[PDB]
Amino acid sequence: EQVNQNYEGHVDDQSIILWEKEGEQVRLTVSEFRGNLYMGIRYWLLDINDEWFPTKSGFSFPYTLETTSQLFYAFTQILSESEVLHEVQKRAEELKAK
């Protein structure tokens, strides 16, 4: 149960693109390290041939029922208070197929 300040020693089990900034790319990542799962953002970087290379840069924290349930709660709460949750969920289901 800990926060990681990089991805040294981690192996990805899932990776989903979020977005990019001049060829630094942000992927939502589930990784395994030291017997435990973590969720976070791993950075992929462009080479000069315009291919994406996974790096060891990013951060993560534990991926458990507790942390995932707290994030789902906190994130949907912030969206509700902003009064946009329904539109965000519709757009997210759109993003699925996509």
| Binder of its own copies out of 9, 18, 36, 53 (CB under 8 A) | 18
Q: Which of residues 24-53 bind its own copies (CB under 8 A)?
A: 24, 26, 28, 30, 39, 41, 43
Whether the Cβ atoms of residue 74 and residue 54 lie closer than 8 Å to each other:
no
Total site size for its own copies, rule CB under 8 A: 51
CA 27 to centroid of chain Cα atoms: 5
From 9, 36, 86, 89, residue interacting with its own copies (rule: CB under 8 A): 89
Core vs surface per residue 41-80: b (16+ CB within 10 A) or e: ebbbeeeeeeeeebeeebebebbeeeeeeeeeeeeeeeee
Q: Which of 9, 53, 72, 86 binds its own copies (CB under 8 A)?
A: 72
Tell me the C-alpha distance between 56 and 43, whole Å.
7
Q: Would you tell me which residues interact with its own copies (CB under 8 A)?
A: 1-3, 5, 12, 14, 16-19, 21, 24, 26, 28, 30, 39, 41, 43, 55, 57-59, 61-62, 65-79, 81-82, 84, 87-89, 91-96
